[PDB]
Amino acid sequence: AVVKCKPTSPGRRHVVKVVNPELHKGKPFAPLLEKNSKSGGRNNNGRITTRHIGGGHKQAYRIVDFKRNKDGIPAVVERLEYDPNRSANIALVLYKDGERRYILAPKGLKAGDQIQSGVDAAIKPGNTLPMRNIPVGSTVHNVEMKPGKGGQLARSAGTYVQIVARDGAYVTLRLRSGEMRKVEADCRATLGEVGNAEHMLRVLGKAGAARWRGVRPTVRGTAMNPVDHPHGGGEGRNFGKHPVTPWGVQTKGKKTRSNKRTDKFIVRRRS
Amino acid sequence: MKRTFQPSVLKRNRSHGFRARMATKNGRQVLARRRAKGRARLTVSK
RNA sequence: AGGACCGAACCGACUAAUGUUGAAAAAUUAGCGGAUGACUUGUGGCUGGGGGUGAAAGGCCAAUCAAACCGGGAGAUAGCU
RNA sequence: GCUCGCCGGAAGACCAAGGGUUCCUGUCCAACGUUAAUCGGGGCAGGGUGAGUCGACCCCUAAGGCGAGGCCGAAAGGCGUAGUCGAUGGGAAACAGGUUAAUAUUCCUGUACUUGGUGUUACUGCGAAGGGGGGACGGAGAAGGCUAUGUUGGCCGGGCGACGGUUGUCCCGGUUUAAGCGUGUAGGCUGGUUUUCCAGGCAAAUCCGGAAAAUCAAGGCUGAGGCGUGAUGACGAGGCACUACGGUGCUGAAGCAACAAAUGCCCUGCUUCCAGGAAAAGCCUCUAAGCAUCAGGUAACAUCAAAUCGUACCCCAAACCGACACAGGUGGUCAGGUAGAGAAUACCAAGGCGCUUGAGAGAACUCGGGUGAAGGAACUAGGCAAAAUGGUGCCGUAACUUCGGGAGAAGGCACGCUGAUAUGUAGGUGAGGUCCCUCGCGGAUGGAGCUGAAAUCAGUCGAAGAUACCAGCUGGCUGCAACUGUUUAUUAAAAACACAGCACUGUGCAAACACGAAAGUGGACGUAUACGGUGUGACGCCUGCCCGGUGCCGGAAGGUUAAUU
RNA sequence: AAUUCCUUGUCGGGUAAGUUCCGACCUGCACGAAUGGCGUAAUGAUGGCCAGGCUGUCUCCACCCGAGACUCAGUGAAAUU
């Protein structure tokens, strides 16, 4: 649910929390945990390659099964768990053979609901089948882009895609960005939508909340000196130049897609 | 007031020690120059 | 419950006086701010000079910074003293 | 040596880091010490650091480093796999007393413990670079049970007072004892045991996981402290023979109870919250390839081994970092009494110090303070500075507001001591006794003793009772920024920088973008409710007109247009 | 007006007297709507202004307690020339 904190002090007036009582109130599944060391936005050269990254709460990675290649073995959801590594929630599923795994939580999946994967699975939220067997027009998520490598599209809090067409060898999809992309009719996709829709309604409410997430403050660029940024300089607030990145790129319309390697799976990029 | 030099034997040897000098081509050139000059103490090892 | 309140440790440095060949190449004294947090601290590690890092002052990078330090080109050049 | 003064959450005690003999004894006083010096962290000489249990080494790994091959790069070299290093983290075991001029959990006395090797005996499925378990983990809060420790009483020893009183409800001191072993309590967690089956745990598995039955409800694990033992011992205030008044043998009384009580322990617990909280080994199990009247494994006993290095001394400082015997800086541990909410503050204990020139004088002036007639901001750029307010309880408290605030608004009243209510109350603690029992560290009743606020009434002293230290000035109007934060180390702390929020724009994942001649890495083990960049800067009401210019995003007929031919 | 040159604009409030301050006026030299406009409770070692209290800030300084200054003994600098 969405709850507005009372303004008992500054920094709590505008805080809006996403309280989900169904989430497990305990430790996660240890066998599916892994170490996850923070990088601070620095690469193997020790240089900051991405700015505004640093600090934050310690996190342990959860091994999430994005492939869903266990076909023909029914599984039952055990509980919903909070995952700090992603906006969506994860669910612990127990298979009939005794194997446990983590999957992205669909919209209306609770504890005790059954899921299945493969070509013979039924059309139910949480089930994963190749898009060839998925009826056209249905809503899916965690869509594979190449057969067997695991889902890569529609993995955020409340994202999803729609299968609009099926040429027979390729299936066209409408991504959350409005792009009309097509992939092979063998890429597994999961029925339903990732269920954390209320994620976008959260309001951090204060600077410290962002720092908990590991986001460091952003310095505009007009506030710097010309030696530091193209926007820097001026006696007061001048900014008499076209908006531009550091390193000198537009940032106000200039398209940067220069892949050209695919250039066939894209149809209606967006807008 | 805190001054610039805060001694630490472990950091002294890891930064300027004999093995650190020998681990890099330029470091070995430092030893060669000091040997040519006749330095009694090549490094800060002890 | 709280980047909540008062206030020691702890971390800061708003005002005044003293000091200014100082006790001290920035401190002392009386007050002052934060003090469960975007906090503070020990140990070790990583980022190297047109580069680093920077809640951005051209700040900081060994008392040195609008381009560190050491050696070399080098007895640079100086229509100037 | 006797007084005086100062610190006492240190200016005491113990360490790490760092230093490296500054430690102890004898001797010397040139230089060093801001003076003298017989003295010293100075000179010279000698002496001093004793470990299976403390630390290192060692086993294990984090960030990160290196890196066989490998990938990449004019050379140098870069990155990185298998691996191998790397603590600031995990991993076996010793306590008390005594002792040296200088070391001790290291020596001695007493009493313990741990991990291995070998051998004997009995019983035996043992076996790994593999599987599983465990190790193994956040913030805040809440009590409850304890101990360290303290106070008082009792007990024991001593004392009878330089000046009135002091044989008593008087005064001083002591009343200490560990690890280990046994007991397994307050309390925490978890339903047990047996059989059968199985797409999982890279193969296997009796182990883990999963499924289905049967059978009992009491099983197990964790666990401070207490009690017993350790201890017929040790220590012990003071005495008695020696006694160079420097000190040693022997002897040595009491050694209990109650109450208070931690920030320490139970607690790696419990409750709760979102920001969702290391790894690996040791350790416990599982079997594979293999080895099977072997080898190995379990238990008992015996025996042997546990090396090597550090150990002095300073360590908030005269020994470390600051050129100094320098008002500086420097992480961890210990935490007594009275008053107090308190680790504030005042005065003290243990302990340690008076800060390495003194002696006089009592001018101006400077520095740091005290007081002040009448006036009370007339000072001044400016109430700069100073003065002032200052505590607890009760009463009371405006505009405005985002309904939380504003607010401790403002303002007013009461505070000491003595007695009584009550020879010490409410409350807390809790003995004996009785009763119960699966009799145990048990339950109920029981209330002795101990401890002990707060309030009312009455009386009483002073100018003054929150008397000292300690300890908010308050209110009205207004600019700027919402706010907590951040910044020019060393003249600027701000209206600047961040900020949550908002918007535009890029980005379909081998993402954009960034660091890299490249490989590759970050972005991200993320996937458009995501990520990068830019501007704006909580919230409220809003954000109008202009696309000629410049930029950006599209367009296709035409014109012009490079290499090439 | 953190923006207004003329300028101490004009009027009103506050003062015995107000180039500052507060409220209006609009002749905006040269405001203006995300390089945001206008409001805004709370917050601020932030800027301006006015009160009560308070005082040696002052009229106008006086005295006193300490450390120097001064004298004696010991040690013994400096800039400059």
CA of residue A55 to C1' of nucleotide E74, angstroms: 64
Determine contact, residues A105/A90, Cβ cutoff 8 Å: yes
- A48: β partners: A42
CATH class of B1-46: mainly alpha
CA of residue A263 to C1' of nucleotide D418, angstroms: 102
A221-250 residues near strand E (Cβ < 7 Å): 222, 237-240
DSSP helix/strand/coil, A128: strand
Between 3.40.50.300, 3.30.300.10, 2.40.50.140, 3.40.50.360, what CATH number should domain A1-113 receive? 2.40.50.140
CATH number given to A195-271:
4.10.950.10
Cβ neighbours of residue A195 closer than 8 Å, sequence gap 6 or more: A88, A89, A105, A106, A107, A108, A109, A158
CA distance A92 to A84: 15
DSSP summary character for residue A216: P
A117-136 residues near strand C (Cβ < 7 Å): none
Determine contact, residues A87/A213, Cβ cutoff 8 Å: no
Chain region(s) in chain A for CATH 2.40.50.140 = 1-113
CA distance A181 to A167: 13
Nucleotides of D under 7 A from a protein CB: 17-19, 62-66, 76-77, 79-80, 87, 132-134, 136-137, 198-200, 209-210, 273-279, 320-322, 328-330, 402-404, 482-484, 496-501, 504-516, 520-523, 525-539, 550-554
Chain region(s) in chain A for CATH 4.10.950.10 = 195-271
A20 CB-side CA count, 13 A: 21
Sign of the C-alpha dihedral computed for residues A87, A93, A98 and A99 taken in this order: negative
Nearest in space to A212 (alpha carbons), one of A28, A62, A11: A11
Nucleotide nearest residue B2, measured CA to C1': D329
Nucleotides of E under 7 A from a protein CB: 35-36, 41-43
Experimentally determined by: cryo-EM
Retrieve residue A212's tokens. 């908990």
CA distance A182 to A269: 11
Residue with tokens 């996709």: A189
Determine contact, residues A16/A201, Cβ cutoff 8 Å: yes
Determine contact, residues A113/A57, Cβ cutoff 8 Å: no
CA distance B30 to A3: 66
DSSP summary character for residue A87: S
